[PDB]
Amino acid sequence: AVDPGPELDGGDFALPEGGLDDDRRLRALDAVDEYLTRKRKHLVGYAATQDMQGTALDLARFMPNNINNLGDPFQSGGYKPNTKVVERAVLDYYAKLWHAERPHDPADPESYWGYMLSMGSTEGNMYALWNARDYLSGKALIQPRNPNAHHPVAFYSEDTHYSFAKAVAVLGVETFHAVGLEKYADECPLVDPVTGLRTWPTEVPSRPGPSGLSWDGPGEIDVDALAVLVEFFAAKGHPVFVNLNLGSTFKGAHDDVRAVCERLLPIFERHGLVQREVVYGSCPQTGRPLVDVRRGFWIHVDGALGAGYAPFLRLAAEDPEGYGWTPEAELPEFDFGLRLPTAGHGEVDMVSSIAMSGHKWAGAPWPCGIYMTKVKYQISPPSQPDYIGAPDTTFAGSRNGFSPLILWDHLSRYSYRDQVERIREAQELAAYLERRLTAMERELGVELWPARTPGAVTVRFRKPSAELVAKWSLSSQDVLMVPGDETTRRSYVHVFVMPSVDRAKLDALLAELAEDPVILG
């Protein structure tokens, strides 16, 4: 029944051979602004902070510059209009926040290395899986018999973002499902809870909900299931890549990164994956191959969303009196500071890489973010281009040097305490939304199927009318309540409570939901 307002008309934007005069140009740009302004003020269905007035005022001045952070962030290079000094400051801030070792130092293998992304976290996850594929397969690093030793196998939950399926295909990294079907067809160690057959699942199971199946579960990886699957492949001699979701796309779940690491480390130690000799190439002689020592596992944290707020929630959890807030749910230790003891290898720093999107929690006018790892994992670049004056250590070639300014400006405006307040208000407002949806069910006698994983900044509920979805940019997901059976489909939407989503905005949405024709029935 509500009005999402008119879309843009392509006729206004057609670019003729002769160009457009100033009046037609301004009319078009005004139409874009009127559209974008209406939509941004009502967007509540995606993990995208929408308020950036301060940014715009501070940084509009930089638009006349063709900024390019071409090459590694830790060398200027020949393209002098670059913001690498700013990029390093932003990377340093997140390195501290994620308990990485600073400063970056190419002679310190344990120190951080990372760079700012020109796409979103899609670039960071692609880079992670490239870096891990090469590291685990034995390609040469920047610093100097088992048939499966150079055949890595990827593991991640059913709540993992579609970017991984893409990245897996781009990079030719094999999932445990693919390798299971190919080489180990009848040896799946898990029993399917629907069919009772030992069929290889397509992703690692996520935890079950009230249904006994994952569709209504919290969206967290099932650690038991993961450990069974990892043991299976590690015992066969495969190196192991694990992606863990810190703020999953639809449910905002946090995989229990510490629990996963505690479970898997003994498996890694049992199967010789903590420290192992790796043959990297060869050359003609009496002998042949070169050799170095590497770990045989790689744990990546997809923190596209959650790496931006989780450190601040955990700060409050550590000092609840000081911040005046005890978070409702525990968020798992997930970062470069996570270190575990072993039987005979000393303490092991468990996480190899993290990705974060800057346009999610912080907010930006275009996609950006961070990939971070450690110097000891850096792969030799694919080539040595003279013409950029800095090593080609990154996924992108030319790199966005405006995004460093965006994030620097954001981070400079807020103290740690202010950042804690932002995640507090969002957590409290997500809880409020869930409370209001169940109250609506009782007031109106309607089913909304509301759900919210404890500690998540998103709430899911029954999809309303198409018009309401379009007004508020609600993101949609269908689930089959019993996998395989198309008659059990439910359509959900979700709301992401970002720092730009306040009580008034949620109350306005709720007032419209209460009068929506699909909701009423």
Ligand X SMILES: *[C@H](N[C@@H](CCSC)C(=O)OC)c1c(COP(=O)(O)O)cnc(C)c1O
Q: Which of residues 174-213 bind ligand X (CB under 6 A)?
A: none
Q: Which amino acid is at 116?
A: M
Selected binder of a copy of itself within 3, 23, 321, 478 (CB under 8 A) = 478
Measured between alpha carbons, how far is 185 from 252 in angstroms, rounded to an integer? 33
245 binds, among a copy of itself, ligand X, none (CB under 5 to 8 A by kind): ligand X
Q: What SS3 state is found at 386? A: helix
Binding mask 44-63 for a copy of itself (x = CB under 8 A): -xx-xxxxxx-xx-xxxxxx
SS3 labels along 41-99: HHCCECCCCCCCHHHHHHHHHHCCCCCCCCCCCCCCCCCCCCCHHHHHHHHHHHHHHCC
Assess whether the previous peptide bond of 103 is cis (omega < 30° from 0). Answer: yes
Choice between 378 and 394, CB closer to ligand X: 394
Residue with tokens 């923190």: 303
- Smallest gap from residue 306 Cβ to ligand X (A): 8
- Over the window 349 to 388, marking each residue x when it contacts a copy of itself by CB under 8 A and - when it does not, the resulting string is --------x-x---xxxxx--------------xx-xxxx
445 binds a copy of itself (CB under 8 A): no
Nearest CA to 289 out of 299, 280, 276, 297 is that of: 280
Strands 339-340, 348-349: pairing kind: antiparallel
Report the nearest approach of ligand X to the CB of residue 455 (Å): 15
HSE-up (13 A, CA, CB side) for residue 188:
22
Instruction: List the one residue from 1, 27, 34, 36 that touches a copy of itself (CB under 8 A).
Output: 36
- Based on the shown chain and the rule CB under 6 A, indicate whether residue 360 belongs to the binding site for ligand X: yes
Judged by CB under 6 A, how many residues of this single chain contact ligand X? 27
| Residue owning tokens 């407002």 | 429
Going by C-alpha positions, the residue among 12, 43, 67 that lies closest to residue 404 is: 67
CB nearer ligand X, residue 43 or residue 95: 43
Give whichever of 71 and 260 is closer to a copy of itself, judged by the CB atom: 71
Question: Of the ranges 30-38, 45-53, 96-104, 313-321, which one interacts with ligand X (CB under 6 A)?
Answer: 45-53
Residue 114 near residue 91, CB atoms below 8 Å: yes
Identify the DSSP state of 402. S
Both tokens assigned to 6: 């008119």
* Contact status: 249 vs ligand X (CB under 6 A): yes
Q: Is 458 in the site for ligand X (CB under 6 A)?
A: no
Among 6, 13, 27, 502, binds a copy of itself (CB under 8 A): 13
DSSP conformational letter for 327 = -
Q: How far is the CB of 264 from a copy of itself (least distance, A)?
A: 26
Residue 17's binding partner, choosing from a copy of itself, ligand X, none, with beta-carbon cut-off 5 to 8 A by kind? a copy of itself
3-state secondary structure at position 263: helix
Which stretch of DSSP H or E encloses residue 421? helix 416-444
Closest residue to ligand X using C-beta atoms:
120
Positions touching ligand X (CB under 6 A) are 46-48, 68, 70, 119-122, 125, 161, 163, 245, 248-249, 302, 304-305, 357, 359-360, 367, 387-388, 397-398, 475
